[PDB]
Write an enzyme that holds these catalytic residues in place. Structure first.
Site, short mmCIF file in Angstrom:
data_model
loop_
_atom_site.label_atom_id
_atom_site.label_comp_id
_atom_site.label_asym_id
_atom_site.label_seq_id
_atom_site.Cartn_x
_atom_site.Cartn_y
_atom_site.Cartn_z
N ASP A 70 19.17 45.08 19.01
CA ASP A 70 18.18 44.00 18.93
C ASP A 70 18.80 42.61 18.79
OD1 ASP A 70 19.12 44.22 16.45
OD2 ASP A 70 17.23 43.69 15.41
N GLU A 197 22.45 33.41 31.68
CA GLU A 197 23.75 33.06 31.05
C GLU A 197 24.65 32.28 31.98
OE1 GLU A 197 24.11 36.82 28.22
OE2 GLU A 197 24.95 36.88 30.17
N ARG A 212 24.55 34.72 36.11
CA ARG A 212 24.53 36.18 36.19
C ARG A 212 23.14 36.65 36.61
NH1 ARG A 212 25.11 39.87 30.67
NH2 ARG A 212 23.93 41.66 31.37
N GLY A 217 21.17 41.65 42.02
CA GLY A 217 22.30 41.00 42.63
C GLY A 217 23.61 41.31 41.96
N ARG A 292 33.63 46.95 32.06
CA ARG A 292 34.21 45.68 31.62
C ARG A 292 35.66 45.93 31.21
NH1 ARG A 292 28.96 43.45 28.06
NH2 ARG A 292 27.54 43.38 29.86
N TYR A 326 32.65 39.13 28.58
CA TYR A 326 32.11 37.88 29.14
C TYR A 326 33.23 36.89 29.44
CZ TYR A 326 27.10 38.27 27.77
OH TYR A 326 25.78 38.58 27.66
C1 LIG Z 1 18.46 39.88 26.69
C2 LIG Z 1 19.10 39.00 27.76
C3 LIG Z 1 20.61 38.97 27.74
C4 LIG Z 1 21.17 38.87 29.19
C5 LIG Z 1 21.05 40.15 29.92
O1 LIG Z 1 21.02 40.19 27.19
C6 LIG Z 1 22.30 40.17 26.56
C7 LIG Z 1 22.95 41.49 26.98
C8 LIG Z 1 24.46 41.38 26.62
C9 LIG Z 1 25.28 42.28 27.30
O2 LIG Z 1 25.25 42.17 28.52
O3 LIG Z 1 26.03 43.08 26.74
C10 LIG Z 1 24.43 41.34 25.06
C11 LIG Z 1 23.63 40.13 24.56
N1 LIG Z 1 23.78 40.38 23.14
C12 LIG Z 1 24.61 39.73 22.36
C13 LIG Z 1 24.50 40.39 21.11
C14 LIG Z 1 25.18 40.02 19.79
C15 LIG Z 1 25.72 38.78 19.63
C16 LIG Z 1 26.34 38.43 18.47
C17 LIG Z 1 26.41 39.32 17.45
C18 LIG Z 1 25.87 40.55 17.59
C19 LIG Z 1 25.27 40.93 18.78
N2 LIG Z 1 23.63 41.37 21.31
N3 LIG Z 1 23.24 41.35 22.53
C20 LIG Z 1 22.28 40.08 25.10
N4 LIG Z 1 21.71 38.74 24.68
C21 LIG Z 1 20.63 38.70 23.81
C22 LIG Z 1 20.06 37.39 23.36
O4 LIG Z 1 20.19 39.68 23.41
CA LIG Z 2 23.94 42.13 38.51
#
Ligand SMILES: CCC(CC)O[C@@H]1C=C(C(=O)O)C[C@H](n2cc(-c3ccccc3)nn2)[C@H]1NC(C)=O
Ligand SMILES: [Ca+2]
Ligand SMILES: *[C@@H]1O[C@H](CO)[C@@H](O)[C@H](O)[C@H]1NC(C)=O
Ligand SMILES: *[C@@H]1O[C@H](CO)[C@@H](O)[C@H](O)[C@H]1NC(C)=O
Length: 394
Positions: A70, A197, A212, A217, A292, A326
């Site tokens: 979450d 992003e 992204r 895509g 990754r 990333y």
């Molecule tokens: C939900 C839309 C975005 C873009 C696909 O989704 C992202 C998927 C990412 C991925 O591609 O792995 C992980 C991202 N994310 C980051 C974190 C986190 C950050 C700091 C501390 C702990 C956890 N948790 N999820 C998440 N963006 C969020 C805000 O949810």
């Molecule tokens: Ca893609």
């Protein structure tokens, strides 16, 4: 203290030299270091800093238990000097945030941090330490932003936001701010495409973004806009796909205008970056096509304006035996290089723990940072280095 113009052209670079490596997870084995994601870099007129998101837990502590995917009320945006570990005693608080962007006027730091519930989140704009404005969610579905540095030119700062489904058509907007006050906004009409992003950088008074696509895509959306927020939007022309997951290059046909996907690569992605080089482009991407792992930068000839498959340069900064994550773009100001172009740089995040390493209960990352130079430079593999599992995993 004056506003930075940042209207200069982006430099032409023939290679990227390593700049810093924070070794945060290695240090965090015994030191007091935050569990983090996405360590992006932004530069002011006197300093470059590594920003990052954390949930307030430290490595090898029971609060690093990762449990669910979450967005948390505990999550915050902090920053340290470039190259430092994200530790408890050097970290400077910027914002409450589970999604963020930050950049520097030339006068003050600007930090945008989003928190709140999925269906009614909002962004708090911090200017010189202070709440100065708010952006509310306009679609009530996880309001989110860049995860990397925004762009400031002539005392005005710009960033891109997304509101809507992460695996379907969503809404995409460009915001313009002045001294932390939103002064304009513009919605980007992009039916069939998915913006998420973005990695943005200044280039001759315009903002250029490589983003992204989390929907259909395996090529990366491209967004360019000016100070009036007039824009053009599409995908990276090059016939080389640079998202993850993707297919091998020979199994791919490029497109300047539409998302190309299928083959099991839909509904996911990774944050990444590119740099326009006249008509060509430097583009980063993971070495592995399905996960990754590894990292390399490709100089694709004419790859910004046509579906070229001609790679004239390739430098690996991390081999396929090591975990990447990333990547994002930023630029060094000229008040500090005494040049007359803007130096392109990128940061690389290297994720350790879940999901790839399931004997650890936690997930964090460390980083390396690279900047472009006039001459070619060789690559190597600057991996994270932490020996897993940790003690808390026992
Ligand atoms: C939900 C839309 C975005 C873009 C696909 O989704 C992202 C998927 C990412 C991925 O591609 O792995 C992980 C991202 N994310 C980051 C974190 C986190 C950050 C700091 C501390 C702990 C956890 N948790 N999820 C998440 N963006 C969020 C805000 O949810
Ligand atoms: Ca893609
Ligand atoms: C992490 O959470 C799981 C599930 O709640 C629990 O079984 C485990 O003991 C926790 N580990 C630590 C170190 O707190
Ligand atoms: C960078 O190279 C391109 C390639 O033609 C050129 O058009 C542009 O003027 C160059 N920019 C600078 C600042 O030298």
């Amino acid at each position: 203290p004056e506003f930075l113009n940042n209207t200069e052209p982006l430099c032409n670079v023939s290679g990227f030299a390593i700049v810093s490596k924070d070794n945060g997870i290695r240090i965090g084995s015994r030191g007091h270091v935050f569990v983090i994601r996405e360590p992006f870099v932004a530069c002011g007129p006197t300093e470059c800093r590594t920003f990052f998101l954390t949930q307030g837990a430290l490595l090898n502590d029971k609060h690093s238990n990762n449990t669910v995917k979450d967005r948390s009320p505990y999550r915050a945006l902090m920053s340290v000097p470039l190259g430092s570990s994200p530790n408890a005693y050097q970290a400077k608080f910027e914002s409450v945030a589970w999604s963020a962007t930050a950049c520097h006027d030339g006068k003050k730091w600007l930090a945008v941090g989003i928190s709140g519930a999925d269906d009614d989140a909002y962004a708090v704009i911090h200017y010189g330490g202070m709440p100065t404005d708010v952006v509310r969610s306009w679609r009530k579905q996880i309001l989110r932003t860049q995860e990397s540095s925004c762009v400031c030119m002539n005392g005005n700062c710009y960033w891109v936001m997304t509101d809507g489904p992460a695996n379907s058509q969503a809404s995409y907007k460009i915001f313009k701010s002045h001294e932390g006050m939103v002064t304009n906004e513009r919605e980007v009409s992009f039916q069939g495409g998915h913006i998420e992003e973005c990695s943005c950088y200044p280039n001759l008074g315009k903002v250029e973004c490589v983003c992204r696509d989390n929907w259909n895509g395996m090529n990366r959306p491209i967004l360019i806009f000016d100070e009036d927020l007039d824009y053009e939007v599409g995908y990276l022309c090059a016939g080389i796909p640079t998202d993850t997951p993707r297919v091998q290059d020979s199994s791919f046909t490029g497109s300047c205008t539409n998302a190309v996907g299928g083959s099991g690569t839909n509904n996911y992605g990774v944050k990444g970056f590119g740099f326009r080089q006249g008509n060509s482009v430097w583009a980063g991407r993971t070495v592995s096509i399905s996960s990754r792992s590894g990292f390399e930068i490709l100089l694709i000839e004419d790859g910004w304006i046509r579906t070229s498959k001609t790679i004239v340069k390739k430098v690996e900064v991390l081999n396929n035996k090591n975990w990447s994550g990333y990547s994002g773009a930023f630029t060094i100001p000229i008040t500090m290089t005494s040049k007359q172009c803007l130096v392109p740089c990128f940061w690389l995040e290297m994720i350790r723990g879940k999901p790839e390493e399931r004997t650890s209960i936690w997930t964090s990352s460390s980083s390396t940072v690279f900047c472009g130079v006039s001459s070619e430079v060789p690559g190597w593999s600057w991996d994270d280095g932490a020996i897993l599992p940790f003690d808390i995993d026992k």
